[PDB]
Amino acid sequence: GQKGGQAIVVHPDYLYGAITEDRYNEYVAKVSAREKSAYKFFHNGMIY
Amino acid sequence: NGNSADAAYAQVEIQPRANIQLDFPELKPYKQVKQIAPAELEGLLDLERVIVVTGFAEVGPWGSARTRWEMEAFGEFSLEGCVEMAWIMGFISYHNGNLKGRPYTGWVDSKTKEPVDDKDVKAKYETSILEHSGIRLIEPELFNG
Amino acid sequence: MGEPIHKIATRGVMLWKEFDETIFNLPKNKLVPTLEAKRDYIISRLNADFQKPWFATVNGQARDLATMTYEEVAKRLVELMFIRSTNSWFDVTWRTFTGDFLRRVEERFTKSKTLSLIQSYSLLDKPDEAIEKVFNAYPAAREQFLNAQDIDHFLSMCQNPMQKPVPFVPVLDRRFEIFFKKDSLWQSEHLEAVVDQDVQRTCILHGPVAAQ
């Protein structure tokens, strides 16, 4: 039905050049903590 | 020389357990990440108008995004991929408690309830996983006969 | 078993008394809900006042096993079970607990069949060096929380009957009374193996009339 589409995805590291070092480092710490909590959640969920 | 001569000579082997990872993107130190984009980019973008993907998943013929990627990129499963597929397909189930007297924490065969070591998942299930995944003859039991 | 005991009224024993009145007397259906509700209070009292502290406490911060790294678990085991003053493991079965944990770490973090970096638990008689050696081989284990499977294994190891009862409370669940009360009498003779060598955490049996 003539449904054409295109999406372009750009490497996420190009986002980080848009922000300051402090913003980036705050984000890195938050994501690191979230990732650890996600692994916790994931393995609990998988086995139960 | 008896058993004491060879007991201290003999040595303990570590068998790997599947440690499935979420594969969050790797974050570089700021200095490295600063070199990829142009210097002018800092403060130039309205970040409310930059759209990012923060998460993704799938359910498909090769399981989840993690297992489908292993099969797509590498053509075979790691230990993590095999255990994930065996769990997805109901081959293995987790067990924490008494199992035939002795206390057991780990995978068992879903049918028999026999303990399964992670290192044995491949030999025990991989052939079944590969036969009952991906593009294959239509299985009537999956489509109401 | 519900039997009266005459103990010196230390902080430890006064905590025991409070929990007898407010937790251990509750029926089974209301126990786990009460533990969940009073969780932070119970943890703070264990850590302040009792001879079995809350295991999952890292630099004075209450955690859970689920929110500790493998390295934090290994180091907490050494902090509670290895006596610096005598440079030894208080009980060999506690050394075996810790060695069995370090092998689990290697198993979880190794990509292939390899040799254990702890061939004999005798290597744990220098526990910091053994920990450093395992976590240098598997540095991902410094950053990752326990796999949920390794939490269950750790708690299964805490209930090993052929072992001196662990000197901590590792979980708040239906077995809390057993974790709290079991093997409560040796600490008054071995204050070197109690958190702050603090007598006030311990159970000393003594009679009120004889005490004169």
Ligand SMILES: NC(=O)c1ccc[n+]([C@@H]2O[C@H](COP(=O)([O-])OP(=O)(O)OC[C@H]3O[C@@H](n4cnc5c(N)ncnc54)[C@H](OP(=O)(O)O)[C@@H]3O)[C@@H](O)[C@H]2O)c1
């Ligand atoms: N009449 C009195 O006034 C009086 C006063 C003090 C004590 N007692 C009695 O003395 C007995 C022990 O007292 P308790 O308060 O210590 O009772 P408890 O807390 O139940 O006993 C300690 C238990 O820990 C285990 N244990 C300790 N060290 C161990 C090791 N190295 N290896 C393996 N297991 C170990 C044993 O249990 P498992 O065998 O189950 O592993 C032992 O039964 C009790 O029967 C108690 O009633 C009586």
